[PDB]
């Protein structure tokens, strides 16, 4: 119950699961310039409104 299941569940298995999920989320892009150029536009507006407005 403790050594083979829960101590494994909390520290290493959770870390591996989270890293795998985030890797799948990040690397799964279709390679279409339309989508991430739209994202570039969003990023530029966010940068001018969040950081630039506060000087």
């Amino acid at each position: 119950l403790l050594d083979l299941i829960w101590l494994e569940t909390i520290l290493p298995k959770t870390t591996s699961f989270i890293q795998m999920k985030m890797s799948i989320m990040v690397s799964n892009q279709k390679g279409l310039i339309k989508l991430y150029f739209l994202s570039f536009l969003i990023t530029i507006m966010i940068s001018m409104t969040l950081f630039n407005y506060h000087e």
Binding site: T14, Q29, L35, Y36, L38, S39, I42, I46, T49, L50, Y53, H54
Partner: protein, 140 residues
Amino acid sequence: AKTLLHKYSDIPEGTECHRKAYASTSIGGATGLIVSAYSIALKPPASFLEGVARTGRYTFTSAAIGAIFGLTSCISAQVREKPDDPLNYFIGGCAGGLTLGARTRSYGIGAAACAYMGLTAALVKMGQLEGWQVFAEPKV
């Protein structure tokens, strides 16, 4: 912007719980809107109405998390008469985590979110108390 952060922060910890909850709700809504914008840009929803649905879902989830966190943090701080105590922020973070778990309808997400958000909120309160800087200004 920092206007929402200041509007949340200028209120004392254990005073005016409704205003603190409102400010937290505003911050959560802004975060959800930004997340929805990026998600729609990178993962097109194939339909305008489905895009509005996804934006509303994300925004409501984030706003609910923020409102619950703010309300419970303020209520605990004022009930215990113990401001500047990280335990109130821990309780608020776990309440927000349980809200997220209920929103996604998953016990594992709820428990993990409660634990991690409680630790993160306690750490944020500790940093506010001790003066920890996330983006340090260059000094040397």
